[PDB]
Design a protein around this ligand. Sequence first.
Ligand code: F3S
Ligand code: F3S
Lengths: 402, 402
Amino acid sequence: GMRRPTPTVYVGRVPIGGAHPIAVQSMTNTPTRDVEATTAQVLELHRAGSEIVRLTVNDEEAAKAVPEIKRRLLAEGAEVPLVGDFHFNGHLLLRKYPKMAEALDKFRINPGTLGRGRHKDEHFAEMIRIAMDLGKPVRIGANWGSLDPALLTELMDRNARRPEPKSAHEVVLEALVESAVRAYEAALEMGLGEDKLVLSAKVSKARDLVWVYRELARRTQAPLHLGLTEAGMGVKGIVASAAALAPLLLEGIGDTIRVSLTPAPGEPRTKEVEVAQEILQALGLRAFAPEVTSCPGCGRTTSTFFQELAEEVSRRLKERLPEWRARYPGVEELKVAVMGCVVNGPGESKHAHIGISLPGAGEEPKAPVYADGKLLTILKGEGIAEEFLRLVEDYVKTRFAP
Amino acid sequence: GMRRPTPTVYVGRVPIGGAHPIAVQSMTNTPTRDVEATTAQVLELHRAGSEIVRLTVNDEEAAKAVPEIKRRLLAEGAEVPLVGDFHFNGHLLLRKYPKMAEALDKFRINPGTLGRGRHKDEHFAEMIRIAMDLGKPVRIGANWGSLDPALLTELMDRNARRPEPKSAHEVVLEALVESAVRAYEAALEMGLGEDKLVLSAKVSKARDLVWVYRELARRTQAPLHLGLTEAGMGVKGIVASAAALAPLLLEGIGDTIRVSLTPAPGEPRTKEVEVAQEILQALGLRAFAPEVTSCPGCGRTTSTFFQELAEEVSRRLKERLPEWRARYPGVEELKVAVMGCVVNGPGESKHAHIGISLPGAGEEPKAPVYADGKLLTILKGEGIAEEFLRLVEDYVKTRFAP
Ligand code: F3S
Ligand code: F3S
């Protein structure tokens, strides 16, 4: 359990907070001014499982496009909450384009991209005023890539007065937290409701992220948008995102997540959504699709045969999921095992809803299948793969019948 | 910090324990009887960064091959510690083939694959006796795929007597821990040294793994071999492994790790080593290679150009690493940033050793480069990529000079 309690903030129809499932979100990478490209990518992300979708609203042409994007989404019955990402000129764009402001379901403010000196407080105030006027929620999202330089100096001076000064790195982290907390407190004091404020304070190193979010969670009551910013490419990005989020999520900290992956060229923007879902599912926080538990396989089993069967099982579950979702409520929780030999095969298969254990070296050429913790059958000969997937189909029909 | 103190256990020349870096290991998936295939894969894994390599010693033909595998490894000056994985007949194989027993650098025992009833205690005793005779360390590795059924019943009965009985799942976890701890205690009582015992107790769900290892860490003083067993295939396997290990590793629990990925057909067995390394590096526990921090890119930057540059930078760092390792001590710690626009580009680049920030929408077409927290130059025109990699080469030569 352990979930941190928070007020509920609605982003469109999606509730965020301690009483609600942790929401997966993402961000487009098309130019927002391109209505056709951006609308298609919003739909793509939403269908992959992005419950909320953010898009940059960076200039006038972007802002003018947002109402039309929203129109086209509604025209296909797609109710996907949109978050506007504002930097530098957020106050100008919201002021000048009230239809954009109304079309968005949430505004993102970064307290480090408000402007210079005195201009900061006024810009912040205008954006919060507009959100208040329209009943919109706001994310106050700090990021250490854009840390308020005047706040850092204030905190550097406080640090230098300590009997034992902390390192420069630690003060940067202090400043990042203080940036978010101060603006949070300022928005509340201005009259913005607790039901309209989400916070983030992102850094790009996992152990720093854990420190930051523990402070945010202690010092505020807001729902928290959690992510490891600038996680990077490929396996590194995936691992770093999972490693940063897991300790916090297991502690009950975090109400919505975004995975900040750099796509490989040609790689679809949906990869980040898949990774976000896998993180939540790995930790038992949500269930999105059936999952396969499979052993690595070693010298006790024939590698090609074992690897191909596991891959075939995973492919079939993926093909059947759209249909299963529609017919079989709760099927998201399905656990299937594919195992290499007698060492752990039966035992792991018995912990799954349904599982197969192949014969390894020195074993009779037969493959026991277990369901609900006991022997269902034993398969042999050709077509082991097809016969098993039929049994999984049969199992699903019965277990997850309405 | 926070590292759990433990005695040091040497596996060949590799020390495991609280005073030592967390060791990456892996396991072969070739038939051990195939000397040529297994020797080549041991070398492959070792060169990828597997500091210790495990291989199954499942039958007589496997056991006879082990001395020859070791001979061939030494013949190329490869000092890679070998762990023998024993199940069911470990006592027979070690007794009958003393040259295999001597060729291994560690024996793995699973207290759930010893045999039936009375036969368990005697088989365990003989294997520990042989390890003691030869001065070998042992891993007592429990796995919930092979949980001792008699111990589970004992613990189920204890549970049923409680005022508030726990769930069956929780008792399985209790039994898994008790399996490892009891055998640990039995080996110590038999005379096996604290410098010769490593423990594991693996499960396939992340939140259960965290519970288990917190108990093991509290109830024992041994170094701990940490892994999420049967993690599975592709992105799911990677994410689940990272998510399970990170909370424990951040708490200071764990002295060596193995990532239990199911390879895709054709996919090299080294992928698990890469993932293990990325987990440790993501958490700042070890450094294996230069890493790139890159933003996801959004509508503020041109997607193809940004993604290609980031990919090109990552490819070049990978190509240069063998040479850099040899010439530039400490280069493993290098942090390079590749960023999409002015929002977080400069700030993140300034936290890296060296970083480039591309021009996004509405910006002048120039790309500032930062090193050691300040502006180094500004690039423009064609060949931005090549000019940046030259600057990174120059930076590395200076920063990491002997
Ligand atoms: S890694 Fe090896 S021990 Fe058997 S169940 Fe898996 S084949
Ligand atoms: S995601 Fe967008 S805000 Fe700029 S630095 Fe990265 S391009």
